Design a protein around this ligand. Structure first.
Ligand code: NA
Ligand code: NA
Ligand SMILES: [Zn+2]
Ligand SMILES: [Zn+2]
Ligand SMILES: [Zn+2]
Ligand SMILES: [Zn+2]
Ligand SMILES: [Zn+2]
Ligand SMILES: [Zn+2]
Ligand SMILES: [Zn+2]
Ligand SMILES: [Zn+2]
Lengths: 362, 362
């Protein structure tokens, strides 16, 4: 007895191409997406070169069109130099990404004034998402209000953050957010097992009280999104571990387990992995696209999932119930029981579809 | 030819009593105030014990009444435990101080939710001031808007901060701010002379561009306030230098020098050291109180000013023009040409005066 789900959308993935293709590329990362029941991904701009200008976006578009196996949109990244220069290409992107905490030299912003400049110059009808932790959530919300527009908060990871967003929504402010599976299914209690290298992630793993607060405030969470952030095991366990977890292949099984346990409903899941991603990012439908899952199959997550080049997972050893059996993408069988059946290049840039443009006033 | 000024008000001083009296006490710190032409001070709550509860405020009130030589009001400090407990004593304080960056364990807040709780529980008609640097300015402004009240930003030190506040004022938001003299008259260029211990201050010294931005945006600065933060030279130059500069004795001479050079007007100075402090904090007039200054006297700041127990100054070697000749406080000569003539205990808590209560609806 399989359950048919719509094509699920992950609005936060790092596919590492260009420039980091030993960690992941479009072909491997979108294989991982399909195996996770995800038929559309929005890829972040912190590649090498970073997607911070029209030439880099043009390159990334061709790499994605040639390598992706599922459909996609590409984010642009905000830099210290590019505010006011992205207007001609802005509508071709998923949205604009602001990295407001750590970051590489090219996506680093050193002043809130630079944030304001981006909010003032990026077209007001197009999405803006932010990596904004702790007080940075409040700070970017202030910039959004000063510029009288919306903002979407990436990977909310803490009680403090979800409660701040809840208070802002109670005041009618235009803010949405997403939560990643590691902030719902891992905590400080897992750091001994993971160790300090594997355990490195931003936002960091929270306390049990953080995790419980996210679940209790499910109504405040608009989307789930993986923050799939692959790095090899050698990198994670070496002298300067980079932050991030792979997550495309584990997200849906973890969440289906929670549905099976009554922690959220199937509808709650589908709002957060399909309907709300569509409406916040104005992402188009995918014709003849669906995912068949077996909700009864119990399995234990292994030391690596089959497709991501990360070749490791922080969820190793967790018992899950639910698995992706088949994915159909735009009328073609894309995945069956561990086999990807669409080639690199099958996927398309949804922003080029007539229905994938973000509506705007003339 | 002396110029008569009104009694000037410094809304940000650290007088170190109780608990740090080798650095300063009420008697020495208020001698320094009078010698700087300051007749009223608002004392911060990061003492030992910190002024975070009614018993500590009661102690501090008696120490100040016995030791102060000029008039004063005492801030309460926000803690992780005291939101909703200060209502009976709130109106007796200068206001509530939030330390939103560094801090000692007792004034440290670990979550923006704790800031919200303070803004929700502190009486809405009473002042709130914050140590809030860089993005923390935007974050606390967001909390103020969510709770629909005002906030005052302490020691604005950077271009980024003054421009953010300027943008908030252009949107009609109820925010005021102050600037300390070291952020107008010192910069990174002075760090070689000061060295890394003496140079430690929070907010840190800014670049030349930061200093220039504060001067260019004088219209955005509501108050000047010293952040007089005395520590001994041994402490400043030892193994863990604490942040802060003494400043009561140098503030007015530095600013009078700037007036003499046409960098701001006498009126600009008096708005920022008298009228705006009064109106933001609802501080009462001082009857028969005035300061006589000699605007022609040129002198060089020495290695220590006469009164602060800090016994050092970062402004050593600067040439100034303008000096305090005489101060009259409530009809008594309080200071003449280097001699303080009112004893410890002459000063009074202005919040106990009938005219010093903050007006409120029944
Ligand atoms: Na393609
Ligand atoms: Na007294
Ligand atoms: Zn992020
Ligand atoms: Zn995101
Ligand atoms: Zn990310
Ligand atoms: Zn549906
Ligand atoms: Zn401060
Ligand atoms: Zn202050
Ligand atoms: Zn201070
Ligand atoms: Zn006047």
């Amino acid at each position: 007895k399989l359950v048919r789900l719509p094509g699920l959308i992950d609005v936060h993935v790092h596919l590492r191409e260009p420039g980091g293709t030993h960690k992941e590329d479009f072909a491997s990362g979108t294989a991982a997406a399909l195996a996770g029941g995800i038929t559309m991904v929005c890829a972040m701009p912190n590649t090498r070169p970073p997607i911070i200008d029209a030439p880099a976006l043009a390159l990334a578009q061709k790499l994605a069109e040639a390598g992706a196996r599922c459909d996609f949109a590409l984010f642009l990244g905000a830099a210290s130099e590019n505010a006011g220069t992205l207007g001609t290409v802005a509508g071709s992107a998923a949205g604009l990404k602001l990295y407001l905490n750590e970051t590489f030299s090219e996506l680093r912003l050193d002043s809130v004034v630079q944030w304001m400049e981006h909010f003032e110059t990026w077209p007001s009808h197009l999405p803006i998402v932010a990596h904004a932790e702790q007080q940075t959530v409040a700070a970017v919300l202030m910039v959004a209000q000063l510029t009288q527009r919306s903002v979407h908060i990436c990977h909310v990871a803490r009680k403090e953050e979800i409660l701040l967003i809840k208070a802002a929504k109670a005041r009618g402010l235009p803010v949405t957010c997403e939560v990643a599976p590691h902030h719902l299914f891992l905590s400080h209690d897992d750091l001994e097992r993971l160790g300090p290298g594997k355990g490195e992630v931003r936002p960091e793993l929270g306390s049990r009280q953080d995790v419980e607060a996210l679940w209790e405030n499910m109504a405040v969470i608009d989307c789930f999104a993986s923050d799939h952030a692959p790095h090899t095991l050698e990198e994670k366990c070496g002298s300067r571990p980079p932050p991030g977890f792979p997550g495309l292949e584990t997200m849906l099984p973890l969440l289906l387990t929670a549905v099976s346990e009554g922690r959220l409903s199937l509808d709650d899941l589908l709002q957060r992995l399909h309907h709300n991603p569509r409406r916040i990012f104005h992402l188009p439908p995918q014709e003849d696209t669906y995912v068949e899952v077996d909700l009864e199959h119990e399995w234990t997550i292994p030391s690596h999932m089959p497709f991501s080049k990360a070749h490791w997972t922080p969820f190793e050893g967790q018992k899950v119930k639910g698995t992706v059996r088949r994915v159909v993408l735009r009328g073609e069988v894309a995945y069956i029981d561990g086999q990807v059946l669409v080639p690199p290049g099958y996927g398309q840039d949804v922003r080029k579809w007539p229905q994938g443009a973000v509506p705007q006033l003339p």
